[PDB]
Design a protein around this ligand. Structure first.
Ligand code: MG
Ligand code: MG
Ligand code: MG
Ligand code: MG
Ligand code: MG
Ligand code: MG
Ligand code: MG
Ligand code: MG
Ligand code: MG
Ligand code: MG
Ligand code: MG
Ligand code: MG
Ligand code: MG
Ligand code: MG
Ligand code: MG
Ligand code: MG
Ligand code: MG
Ligand code: MG
Ligand code: MG
Ligand code: MG
Ligand code: MG
Ligand code: MG
Ligand code: MG
Ligand code: MG
Ligand code: MG
Ligand code: MG
Ligand code: MG
Ligand code: MG
Ligand code: MG
Ligand code: MG
Ligand code: MG
Lengths: 106, 98, 197, 137, 51, 172
RNA sequence: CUGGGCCAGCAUCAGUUUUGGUGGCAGGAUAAAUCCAUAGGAAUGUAGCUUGCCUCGGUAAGUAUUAUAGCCUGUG
RNA sequence: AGAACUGGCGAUGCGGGAUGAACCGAACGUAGAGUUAAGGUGCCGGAAUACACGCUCAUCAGACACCACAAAAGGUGUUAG
RNA sequence: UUUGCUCCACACAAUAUAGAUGGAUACGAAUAAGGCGUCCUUGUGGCGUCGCUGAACCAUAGCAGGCUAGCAACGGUGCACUUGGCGGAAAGGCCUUGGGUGCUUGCUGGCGAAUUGCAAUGUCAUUUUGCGUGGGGAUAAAUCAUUUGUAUACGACUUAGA
């Protein structure tokens, strides 16, 4: 097993926003391979996770996770909306994100 | 509400175990389970009373020997069952089959 | 979906390649553009020479240093189109642009790396036929670019090597075919075929 | 070789009986046959065997195949059917690598996880004997 | 304390207006018309397809 | 103005003292729904007779479907239209498979070529041309030859993904 | 070391909502078409026929409205 | 510069018109979910480098109300009539 | 000056990270034309074939991948070695030779996994920077001050001094 991965690869594009006013409370996400609202429905409800590092080790681990879930589709092009427990950093715009298979309905 | 699960143990280390339905991809493939007892297992059976009982270890063997019997019938079902699932490059789960 | 993405600048339309390249960066994609000299601009040469000259005549009146800078080489003609489409004065923007690299001719690392094209910025696919367009290198040399000749020299020299390379490779797969056959219609062959392979 | 050599570029023609692969929509993936030409961008197609209803179509949303058969301009569905059958069009189609690739494409898409697994194990077995052969000549 | 809608929640649907019970039971959200044969006069269709 | 429909619209002046049962008039109207159809009836009926709808009624609305909708035909179209400086009469031909189709492209054409919006255009008459070579305008006539066939050079396949690993071909 | 407090997952519900699949009905020119039958008819004239040309393969004009293709219009 | 009716600004933030007293949309308790308006959806920038028929090539093209101007006059450019 | 100093192995505490998680998979060119194969007069040539997307290709089974017995190959791959070459556009990489060695899922066996309790929280990537071991290695200048006047408002410049 060269591969170990059970998530689909995703990007963090943006907060929800108008031209000139943003909303940190929702986050727009680009899910690799997904190209349409139709498609992006599959991942609604699924669990997102932003995984980052830090100096001050907490749980024996210096790796931390921001969790949240995909909530609805966005636009016409497979892009999708997410709430996280705590809104994502914004320095994270263009960072990678992880979209999981649970809660599975397959 | 949970799913009794088994592996089988001798096939890939997984015990007779509980698992939540919402965290499982049910695949298309299926092995027969007629000749497997599966009666004694219930909530209380798993109810935590460190050190595994000799019952559990035995029940495993009972249940497994039948499943591995049925598994081995079809080619590569055993080997499949031992290998771990993982998304390869450009897997699009949202229209893969399983 | 690729750590880095090399783009053969050739036959692309500046603004459209610029627009796609620029969104890629903002999304976290590392892009490196090669052969910028063989890049296109819609409209006939004279037009875009005229345009560049309008760009040229602007400069801080009291100190030409402060005022707008007029990069001449194709890579930077393109970087201008590109930067204009990024919020380049913000932290985010500066970061975006630092995921970009833009060369003229394709120069080591990438000499042996695979480049791609961007269809939706592919001049041939895009421009109506008969419509006049501009080659970026000619424009540049025309407004002061010093190095078209050299890039031409190095490029040819490289195309030489790359040929003997491909010719080797095109022949290796000859050998791979000779032994492909012996297995081409073996038993697992017909068996893999069953499942689409 | 003192002939006049003129590279005679060989286009698929829009003509009566030119058969076409429908690209988008309710009849996507199906084969129809051009029956009459409406204008430079529109035609009247009909695909009785395939179950595509006789209609005007925008030449945009259909792709011309190299298959063309004998058909009289403006033929009604019924005879469009009669001639296509006679023409063994479907047969010729499924014979093309264009057709087969579509179907392979279709087949992979269908594979279940376990199936997919087996394809790996067989690809592994075939590679062994291939690398072997390779390293001998 | 909480307005419940009768077009969801069959219970409050049944509290307001019963008959729903028979409505549902007797289908009749479908129900076919009885066929007839009234054909339109020749003048009618002359005029339809006129000019 | 959308997907066009043709309507038989029939109406009459309201009945009275002296004229119990007045005369019925009919129009064919290309509109996109009934509400427009009936309104465009009363528009013309004001301009031809001197009825106002306040003193009239609409006796019937019927949709006139196309007879042979899968038979290509050549329509002649007569148009009155208003320009930035005058108002003019036209005749043009449109080749299509239905009356309603013909009108859509008429309305588009008037708008591309002469910048005429729906409001500035009366449709005078639209009629199938029975005898070929009564076809007057060339841009249709050139489709009427025996054994017509043409190619469709320079084909631009739309790409799905943004990068492609092969330099595309335009080779239909 | 259990009980609290808090946080979470799943289940079954309630309220608000969003995005799919699918069942049964109604109307119209009781859709219009296709299809079937029949009448008529033409040309971007199918087969034959006539005719110079011919590689005797076939060609081009003329005739001829279904024939060794087919189409259009009406009615049912 | 001065009257008429109404609606505004003034006293009023909010979304749109880059910008802006007065335009368009819409008026404001602290918030959640949904849907919109006017306006937008290549990239800057949230949102189809969507679909469809035309038109246009400018060695001074053009690109959206208020609005940030253009005329008499003329062209064997090209399109339709 | 009293710490020294530089280079190769892995070792320990901090430190930072615009965001690894199977693979950035190398002709050139045309697009009203081309790719691949094959033949030849090696060409604006002959024949065959292909596209209609990378929905490819390669890799992918094994305690986050343990232990163990063989079979059939003589292949695959990794690690340090080694024989030749080639690469200066930023070559800092590429091809090749001969073994050695770990693995090999091409194949057939014997074990192991649990109780991490139904998800949380479970592979650790690379930067720097300090110390630590042992191995190789090297043993300078610059500034102040003084001095020149090809220089100079002050700094700066330019000379000179064991
Ligand atoms: Mg948003
Ligand atoms: Mg351009
Ligand atoms: Mg410029
Ligand atoms: Mg100047
Ligand atoms: Mg800003
Ligand atoms: Mg080189
Ligand atoms: Mg006027
Ligand atoms: Mg008018
Ligand atoms: Mg406790
Ligand atoms: Mg609910
Ligand atoms: Mg018939
Ligand atoms: Mg007002
Ligand atoms: Mg005041
Ligand atoms: Mg206000
Ligand atoms: Mg403005
Ligand atoms: Mg108003
Ligand atoms: Mg900008
Ligand atoms: Mg956007
Ligand atoms: Mg010109
Ligand atoms: Mg105006
Ligand atoms: Mg003119
Ligand atoms: Mg690989
Ligand atoms: Mg060829
Ligand atoms: Mg490939
Ligand atoms: Mg094993
Ligand atoms: Mg095992
Ligand atoms: Mg472990
Ligand atoms: Mg053995
Ligand atoms: Mg060992
Ligand atoms: Mg979780
Ligand atoms: Mg002096």
């Amino acid at each position: 097993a060269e591969s170990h991965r059970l998530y689909v690869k995703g990007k963090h594009l943006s907060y929800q926003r108008s031209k000139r006013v943003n909303n940190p409370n929702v986050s727009l996400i680009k899910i690799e391979g997904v190209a349409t609202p139709q498609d992006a429905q599959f991942y609604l409800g699924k669990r997102i996770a932003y995984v980052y590092r830090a100096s001050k080790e907490v749980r024996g681990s210096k790796i931390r996770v921001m969790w949240g879930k995909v909530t609805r589709t966005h636009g016409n092009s497979g892009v999708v909306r997410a709430t996280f427990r705590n809104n994502l950093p914004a320095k994270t715009f263009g960072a990678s994100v992880r979209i999981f298979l649970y809660p599975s309905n397959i | 509400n949970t799913l009794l699960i088994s592996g089988p143990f001798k096939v890939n280390g997984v015990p007779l175990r509980r698992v939540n339905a919402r965290y499982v991809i049910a695949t298309s493939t299926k092995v027969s389970v007629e000749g497997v007892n599966v009666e004694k297992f219930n909530v209380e059976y798993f109810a935590k009373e460190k050190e595994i009982k000799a019952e559990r270890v035995e029940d495993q063997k009972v249940v497994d020997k039948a499943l591995i019997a049925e598994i081995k019938k079809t080619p590569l079902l055993k080997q499949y069952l031992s290998a771990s699932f993982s998304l390869k490059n450009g897997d699009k789960p949202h229209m893969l089959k399983f | 979906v690729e750590p880095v993405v090399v783009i053969d600048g050739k036959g692309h339309l500046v603004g459209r390649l610029a627009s796609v390249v620029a969104k890629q960066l903002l999304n976290g994609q590392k892009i490196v553009v090669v052969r910028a000299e063989e890049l296109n601009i819609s409209g006939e040469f004279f037009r875009n020479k005229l345009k560049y000259h309008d760009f040229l005549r602007k400069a801080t009146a009291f100190n030409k240093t402060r005022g707008p800078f007029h990069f001449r080489a194709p890579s930077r003609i393109f970087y201008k189109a590109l930067r204009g489409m990024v919020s380049h004065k913000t932290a985010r923007g500066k970061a975006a642009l630092e995921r970009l690299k833009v060369f003229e001719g394709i120069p080591p690392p990438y000499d042996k790396k695979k480049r791609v094209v961007v269809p939706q910025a592919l001049r041939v696919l895009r421009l109506k036929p008969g419509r006049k367009y501009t080659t970026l290198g000619k424009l540049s040399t025309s407004v002061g670019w010093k190095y078209e000749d050299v890039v031409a020299k190095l490029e040819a020299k490289r195309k030489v090597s790359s040929a003997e390379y491909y010719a080797k490779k095109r022949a290796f797969t000859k050998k791979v075919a000779s032994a492909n056959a012996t297995a081409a219609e073996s038993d697992v062959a017909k068996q893999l075929a069953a499942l689409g392979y | 070789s003192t002939d006049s050599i003129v590279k005679a570029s060989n286009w698929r023609l829009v003509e009566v009986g030119r058969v076409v692969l429908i690209k988008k929509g309710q009849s996507a993936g199906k084969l129809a046959a051009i029956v009459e030409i409406i204008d430079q961008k529109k035609v009247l197609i009909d695909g009785p065997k395939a179950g595509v209803p006789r209609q005007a179509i925008n030449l945009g949303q259909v792709v011309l195949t190299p298959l063309t058969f004998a058909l009289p301009r403006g033929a009604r569905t019924a005879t469009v059917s009669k001639k296509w059958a006679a023409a063994a069009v479907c047969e010729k189609w499924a014979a093309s690598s264009w057709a087969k690739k579509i179907a392979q494409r279709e087949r992979r898409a269908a594979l279940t996880d376990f199936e997919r697994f087996q394809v790996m194990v067989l690809r592994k077995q075939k590679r062994y004997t291939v690398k072997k052969a390779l390293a001998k000549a | 304390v909480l307005k419940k809608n009768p077009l969801k929640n069959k219970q409050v649907l049944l509290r307001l207006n019963p008959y729903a019970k028979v409505f549902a039971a007797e289908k009749l959200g479908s129900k076919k018309a009885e066929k007839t044969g009234t054909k339109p006069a020749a003048v009618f269709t002359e005029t339809l397809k006129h000019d | 103005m959308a997907h066009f429909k043709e309507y038989q619209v029939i109406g009459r002046r309201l009945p009275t003292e002296s004229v119990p049962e007045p005369k019925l008039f009919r129009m064919r109207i290309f509109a996109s729904n009934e509400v427009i159809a009936k309104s465009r009836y009363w528009y013309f009926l004001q301009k031809l007779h001197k009825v106002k709808k306040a003193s009239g009624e609409i006796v019937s609305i019927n949709q006139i479907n196309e007879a042979h909708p899968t038979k290509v035909k050549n329509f002649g179209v007569w148009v009155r239209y208003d320009s930035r400086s005058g108002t003019h009469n036209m005749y043009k031909e449109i080749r299509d498979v239905s009356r309603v189709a013909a009108v859509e492209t008429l309305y588009q054409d008037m708008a591309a070529r002469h910048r005429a919006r729906f409001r500035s255009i009366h449709i005078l008459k639209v009629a199938e041309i029975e005898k070929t070579a009564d076809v007057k305008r060339q841009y249709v006539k050139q489709f009427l030859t025996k054994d017509l066939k043409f190619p469709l050079p320079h084909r631009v396949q739309k790409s799905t993904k943004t990068f492609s690993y092969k330099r595309p071909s335009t080779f239909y």
